[PDB]
Amino acid sequence: PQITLWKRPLVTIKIGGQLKEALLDTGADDTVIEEMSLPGRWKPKMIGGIGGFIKVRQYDQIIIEIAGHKAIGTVVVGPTPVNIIGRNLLTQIGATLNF
Amino acid sequence: PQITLWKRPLVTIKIGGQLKEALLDTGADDTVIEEMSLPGRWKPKMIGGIGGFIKVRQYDQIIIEIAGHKAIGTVVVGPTPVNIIGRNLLTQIGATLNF
Numbered sequence: 001p002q003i004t005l006w007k008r009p010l011v012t013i014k015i016g017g018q019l020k021e022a023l024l025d026t027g028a029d030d031t032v033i034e035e036m037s038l039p040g041r042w043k044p045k046m047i048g049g050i051g052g053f054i055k056v057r058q059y060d061q062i063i064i065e066i067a068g069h070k071a072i073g074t075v076v077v078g079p080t081p082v083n084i085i086g087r088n089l090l091t092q093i094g095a096t097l098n099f
Numbered sequence: 100p101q102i103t104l105w106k107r108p109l110v111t112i113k114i115g116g117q118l119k120e121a122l123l124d125t126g127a128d129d130t131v132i133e134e135m136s137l138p139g140r141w142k143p144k145m146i147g148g149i150g151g152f153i154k155v156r157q158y159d160q161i162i163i164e165i166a167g168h169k170a171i172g173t174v175v176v177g178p179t180p181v182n183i184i185g186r187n188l189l190t191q192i193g194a195t196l197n198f
């Protein structure tokens with residue numbers, strides 16, 4: 001699709017068999033997901049957003065569908081206003097910005 | 100242009116007579132610029148994201164040249180770690196996300 005930006009670019013994602021809403025976020029390096037159960041081991045990461053740094057749990061090689069497009073990659077779990085799909089997965093689904 | 104997302108989508112902007120680097124950010128409702136003076140009236144606001152909230156000054160009817168494209172709208176100014184072009188101005192330059 002071609003997504004205009006008059007409204008927030010919210011899509012449905014599927015992770016762990018569950019559908020969730022997420023924001024397509026070109027200003028995010030990383031994909032940040034609200035607290036949920038994911039398989040496997042995690043490693044620590046600090047991410048710096050608009051209000052400061054926070055600790056998140058980094059899970060690698062997680063299967064995730066984004067607006068019907070398949071991705072497998074890193075997700076970080078921690079406190080976020082909304083699930084955000086960042087560039088690490090936007091590149092997997094072939095997203096570009098165009099003007 | 101078509102901008103891929105392998106790297107942060109940074110562009111040069113001109114605001115208040117000043118050149119700056121800013122992120123084209125589909126996950127940002129508002130355009131957020133680091134501390135600078137702008138003409139006219141303002142009013143305070145809080146904006147929030149990962150790590151919490153910051154206090155900003157909201158200025159309305161500000162013109163910004165974004166990668167050569169002029170756009171007018173509200174700009175908020177405060178202690179952001181990065182300059183952000185949000186959806187309120189991305190729409191005006193006809194930016195879309197495509198995949």
Ligand SMILES: COc1ccc(S(=O)(=O)N(C[C@H]2CCC(=O)N2)C[C@@H](O)[C@H](Cc2ccccc2)NC(=O)O[C@@H]2C[C@@H]3CCO[C@@H]3C2)cc1
Pocket residue numbers: 023025026027028029030031032047048049050051080081082084086124125126127128129130131146147148149180181183185
């Ligand atoms: C009301 O207007 C706004 C409100 C908040 C923001 S935000 O900068 O907090 N943010 C909002 C996103 C995240 C939460 C949400 O609902 N939408 C814009 C983001 O693009 C932000 C933009 C951003 C803010 C501060 C630093 C760098 C980028 N990036 C971000 O938080 O990315 C996180 C932090 C990590 C650094 C970059 O990637 C990592 C993942 C911008 C305008």
Ligand SMILES: [Cl-]
Pocket residue numbers: 072073074088089
């Ligand atoms: Cl990844």
Ligand SMILES: [Cl-]
Pocket residue numbers: 171172173187
């Ligand atoms: Cl506006």
Ligand SMILES: [Cl-]
Pocket residue numbers: 004193
């Ligand atoms: Cl349009």
Ligand code: NA
Pocket residue numbers: 036037038
């Ligand atoms: Na867990």
Ligand code: NA
Pocket residue numbers: 138139140158159160161
């Ligand atoms: Na004004």
